[PDB]
Amino acid sequence: ATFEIVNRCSYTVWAAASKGDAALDAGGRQLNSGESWTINVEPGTKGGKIWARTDCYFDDSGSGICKTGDCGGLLRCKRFGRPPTTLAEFSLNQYGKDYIDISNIKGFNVPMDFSPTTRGCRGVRCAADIVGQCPAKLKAPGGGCNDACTVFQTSEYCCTTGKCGPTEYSRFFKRLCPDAFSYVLDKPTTVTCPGSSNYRVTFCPT
Numbered sequence: 001a002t003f004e005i006v007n008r009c010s011y012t013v014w015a016a017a018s019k020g021d022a023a024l025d026a027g028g029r030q031l032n033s034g035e036s037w038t039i040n041v042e043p044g045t046k047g048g049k050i051w052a053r054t055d056c057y058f059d060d061s062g063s064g065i066c067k068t069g070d071c072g073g074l075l076r077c078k079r080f081g082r083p084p085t086t087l088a089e090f091s092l093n094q095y096g097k098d099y100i101d102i103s104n105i106k107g108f109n110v111p112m113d114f115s116p117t118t119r120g121c122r123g124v125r126c127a128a129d130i131v132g133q134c135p136a137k138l139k140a141p142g143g144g145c146n147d148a149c150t151v152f153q154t155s156e157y158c159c160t161t162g163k164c165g166p167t168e169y170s171r172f173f174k175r176l177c178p179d180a181f182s183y184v185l186d187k188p189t190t191v192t193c194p195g196s197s198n199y200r201v202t203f204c205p206t
């Protein structure tokens with residue numbers, strides 16, 4: 001499957017793509033304002049994620065640091081990134097279907113639209129100003145708005161026992177972006193697309 005990743009933000013981001021134990025395609029790249037990066041993701045990829053990173057510094061060996069979304073100091077991510085990170089999530093070719101969603105379960109750093117470029121399903125978007133409105137206890141100094149699990153590390157916020165409800169903090173994310181997961185047991189906002197669809201991820205879509 002093809003994913004086109006487009007940075008429409010006025011600032012540079014460093015895109016990342018990983019299925020947790022491995023890079024997807026090159027795994028990461030700098031995207032200046034307006035740049036597009038096209039990657040190929042193997043059919044059958046389960047649990048893939050794409051996100052943006054802000055305020056990164058890398059040396060010539062592709063090693064360094066980012067203020068949001070850092071994946072152990074690497075330009076090319078092999079693993080998932082440190083919150084806060086707005087997440088485009090996907091599982092491809094699962095019994096003939098693709099499943100896509102956007103999630104704020106790991107917080108929010110950059111607004112995002114996640115849309116199919118082929119026929120047969122709709123896209124999802126979280127483009128509200130979550131950072132500007134972020135509750136004070138969730139504000140990350142580096143930028144972005146952390147989820148409550150990352151900040152407080154309780155069973156209720158992390159949904160550790162498999163049982164948990166919504167919270168004042170989850171409802172904040174849900175109010176600004178109803179189409180994104182706001183906590184682990186949120187009512188699914190997953191979208192079902194035809195198997196082997198293609199997609200575009202746009203940072204700062206509006």
Ligand SMILES: NC[C@H]1O[C@H](O[C@H]2[C@H](O)[C@@H](O)[C@H](N)C[C@@H]2N)[C@H](N)[C@@H](O)[C@@H]1O
Nearest residue numbers: 070071072079080081082083106149150
């Ligand atoms: N709070 C301190 C610890 O956890 C943080 O966040 C984790 C974060 O909890 C994971 O969900 C993420 N995938 C990686 C990230 N390292 C920090 N990134 C690390 O400093 C440390 O692992």
